[PDB]
Amino acid sequence: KDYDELLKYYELHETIGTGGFAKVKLACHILTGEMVAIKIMDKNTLGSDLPRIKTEIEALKNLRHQHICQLYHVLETANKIFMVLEYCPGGELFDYIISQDRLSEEETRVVFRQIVSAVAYVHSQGYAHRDLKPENLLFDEYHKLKLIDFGLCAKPKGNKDCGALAYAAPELIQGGSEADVWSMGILLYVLMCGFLPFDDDTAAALVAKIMRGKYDVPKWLSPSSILLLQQMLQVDPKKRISMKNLLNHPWIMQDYNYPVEWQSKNPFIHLDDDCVTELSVHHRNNRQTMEDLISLWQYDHLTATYLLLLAKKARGKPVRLR
Amino acid sequence: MKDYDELLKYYELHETIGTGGFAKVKLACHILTGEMVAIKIMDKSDLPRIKTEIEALKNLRHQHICQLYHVLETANKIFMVLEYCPGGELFDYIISQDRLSEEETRVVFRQIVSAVAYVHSQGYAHRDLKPENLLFDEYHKLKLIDFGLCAKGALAYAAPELIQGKSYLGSEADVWSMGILLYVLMCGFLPFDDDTAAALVAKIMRGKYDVPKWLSPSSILLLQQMLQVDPKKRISMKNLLNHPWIMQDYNYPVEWQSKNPFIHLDDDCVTELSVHHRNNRQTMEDLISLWQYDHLTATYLLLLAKKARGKPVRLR
Numbered sequence: 001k002d003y004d005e006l007l008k009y010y011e012l013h014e015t016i017g018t019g020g021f022a023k024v025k026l027a028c029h030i031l032t033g034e035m036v037a038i039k040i041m042d043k044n045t046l047g048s049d050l051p052r053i054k055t056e057i058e059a060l061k062n063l064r065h066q067h068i069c070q071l072y073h074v075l076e077t078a079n080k081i082f083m084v085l086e087y088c089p090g091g092e093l094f095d096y097i098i099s100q101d102r103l104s105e106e107e108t109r110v111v112f113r114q115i116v117s118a119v120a121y122v123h124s125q126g127y128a129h130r131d132l133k134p135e136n137l138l139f140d141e142y143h144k145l146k147l148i149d150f151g152l153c154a155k156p157k158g159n160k161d162c163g164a165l166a167y168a169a170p171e172l173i174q175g176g177s178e179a180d181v182w183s184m185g186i187l188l189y190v191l192m193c194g195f196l197p198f199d200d201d202t203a204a205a206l207v208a209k210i211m212r213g214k215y216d217v218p219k220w221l222s223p224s225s226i227l228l229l230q231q232m233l234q235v236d237p238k239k240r241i242s243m244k245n246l247l248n249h250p251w252i253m254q255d256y257n258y259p260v261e262w263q264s265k266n267p268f269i270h271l272d273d274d275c276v277t278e279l280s281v282h283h284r285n286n287r288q289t290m291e292d293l294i295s296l297w298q299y300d301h302l303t304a305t306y307l308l309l310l311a312k313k314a315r316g317k318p319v320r321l322r
Numbered sequence: 323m324k325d326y327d328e329l330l331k332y333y334e335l336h337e338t339i340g341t342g343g344f345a346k347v348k349l350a351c352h353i354l355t356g357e358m359v360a361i362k363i364m365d366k367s368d369l370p371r372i373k374t375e376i377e378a379l380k381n382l383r384h385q386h387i388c389q390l391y392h393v394l395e396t397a398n399k400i401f402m403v404l405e406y407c408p409g410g411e412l413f414d415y416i417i418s419q420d421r422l423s424e425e426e427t428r429v430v431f432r433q434i435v436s437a438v439a440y441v442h443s444q445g446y447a448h449r450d451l452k453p454e455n456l457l458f459d460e461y462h463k464l465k466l467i468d469f470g471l472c473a474k475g476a477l478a479y480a481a482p483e484l485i486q487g488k489s490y491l492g493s494e495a496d497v498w499s500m501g502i503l504l505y506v507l508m509c510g511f512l513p514f515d516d517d518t519a520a521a522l523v524a525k526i527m528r529g530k531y532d533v534p535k536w537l538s539p540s541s542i543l544l545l546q547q548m549l550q551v552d553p554k555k556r557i558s559m560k561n562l563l564n565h566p567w568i569m570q571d572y573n574y575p576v577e578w579q580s581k582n583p584f585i586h587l588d589d590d591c592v593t594e595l596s597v598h599h600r601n602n603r604q605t606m607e608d609l610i611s612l613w614q615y616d617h618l619t620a621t622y623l624l625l626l627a628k629k630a631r632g633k634p635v636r637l638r
């Protein structure tokens with residue numbers, strides 16, 4: 001009874017889940033033929049941490065970006081919440097870092113310009129992620145990074161509602177968007193060094209290192225790398241580099257000579273007309289109210305079919321259902 | 323990273339297979355033996371539950387229980403090095419096909435029965451038997467997992483006396499759950515199911531269920547012996563092991579006794595660990611016999627499996 005609605009729309013394959021509450025079940029969307037990943041939560045096993053699932057869904061319903069792992073479809077049965085998500089077979093950025101030694105400056109940049117694109121867009125929409133680390137970034141079948149787990153979340157100019165400690169800003173530990181900038185700075189350091197700037201045996205010694213904020217600057221780090229690191233690793237969050245200045249930073253533009261393009265290429269308001277026409281021939285009605293219907297963004301089957309059609313059109317394969 | 327330094331002396335890390343807050347599962351290679359392993363990584367979020375499981379798995383050793391090799395505790399993590407189970411959940415198996423045949427469900431059920439009868443012999447009751455908690459190893463052999471709710475779950479699997487406050491448990495509640503499991507294997511869905519949780523409870527108490535046309539009268543008889551609302555009326559484990567349904571095609575009852583020993587030690591393995599350590603031998607055996615669930619416990623038990631798969635009793 002929990003799978004009857006899900007199985008009208010999706011053919012279920014393997015289990016890259018079998019975690020706690022949330023198993024990932026690789027699956028195929030029947031109409032389009034595109035590969036999806038299905039996050040499965042237990043609506044009466046999840047404890048007092050169902051608010052995290054709801055904070056994530058409501059952030060993912062409002063965020064749309066080339067470097068954010070897309071939500072296609074939400075399904076709620078008796079004891080189960082289902083999230084139909086974008087396909088990421090390439091592993092975590094974490095798995096990437098721990099397989100190789102340390103990355104070169106130009107290799108970290110290629111990566112880091114993608115983290116910056118995503119996190120800058122999050123902040124434009126009034127959100128702050130609050131748990132940026134290399135586990136929470138995944139690689140798609142085209143080697144591009146996707147940001148995941150908005151389980152902790154913002155609206156810092158919104159209504160009243162921590163993460164990994166080695167990534168946590170000083171002001172976070174003692175109680176904005178500037179906390180995320182600190183965490184991108186920790187991320188930048190590990191990519192180039194192969195080790196954290198602050199690490200210890202006990203948690204109480206880790207906190208003391210974050211507050212004092214003194215760190216090692218390895219011999220192989222360039223002076224451009226060092227300068228950007230100290231702008232991002234400011235203990236005072238008012239002294240930390242702004243996103244407007246990060247986007248076009250001299251280290252950030254080496255070998256690219258254009259700034260980070262953060263603005264979304266995945267639209268809410270514009271409707272692709274190849275997709276509207278193919279959905280119209282399938283559902284059998286007029287494109288006028290077809291557009292009106294998609295524009296509700298209910299994150300049902302129609303939202304899943306529209307956005308997956310748009311993903312198939314992006315691949316190169318044709319705009320076709322069955 | 324300081325949290326991975328101890329682990330990474332012993333294990334080469336692979337695939338990141340399964341997020342979920344505190345509990346993440348990474349695939350790993352044990353460097354000395356070359357044997358594949360699964361690593362459960364806890365973000366040190368109910369840590370009495372992690373500690374009940376480790377404590378139960380340190381004392382349980384069985385061919386149809388997913389083996390613990392090694393426990394590692396760093397600052398912010400707990401690592402459990404567990405048996406390799408690439409074959410998926412029994413759950414995934416059931417939902418891919420429609421329903422299983424009686425003889426296909428017998429092959430599968432006799433393993434569930436072998437494992438659960440051994441759990442109960444050691445003074446334990448699992449309390450969360452369901453098809454998500456039974457995994458297939460690389461030989462298509464079932465391994466029972468998650469002893470986090472065990473005593474010394476899912477409502478559709480919960481016994482009537484469990485729901486309304488016991489007075490008291492424990493082993494007969496497991497028998498009810500094996501009965502729910504038996505039904506789903508043969509039918510392709512539950513004897514008690516509903517849209518709301520409040521309607522599910524009411525169905526479990528009255529205990530009346532549909533008996534599909536394709537279920538044999540042997541299947542029906544065993545089902546009603548296991549699905550007794552009164553736990554005193556429910557079939558005993560002594561009678562389950564040699565039940566006529568349990569034996570129909572097999573010339574013999576369920577062998578529940580462990581083939582994985584704590585006390586008796588393999589000499590071929592012992593003499594290979596001795597050449598590595600540059601120990602005498604009486605010391606070597608005395609040391610394994612501590613069962614500390616460190617690297618020496620991981621290396622001994624993985625050497626025992628390498629010995630069993632036909633490859634040589636040799637370290638790398």
Ligand SMILES: COc1cc(-c2cn[nH]c2)ccc1C(=O)Nc1ccc2c(c1)CC[NH2+]CC2
Binds near residue numbers: 016017022085086
């Ligand atoms: C384990 O995750 C995946 C594996 C494969 C895959 C593996 N092999 N081939 C494909 C493909 C995709 C995923 C995936 O997208 N998972 C995912 C998406 C969002 C979130 C999570 C996971 C973590 C839980 N918290 C919410 C955020």
Ligand SMILES: COc1cc(-c2cn[nH]c2)ccc1C(=O)Nc1ccc2c(c1)CC[NH2+]CC2
Binds near residue numbers: 017019388409467
């Ligand atoms: C989540 O996976 C496991 C959990 C436990 C466990 C949990 N609790 N106690 C033991 C024990 C073993 C595993 C495991 O080994 N799974 C696994 C192995 C290989 C592969 C996969 C999974 C993904 C599917 N594709 C093939 C690759």
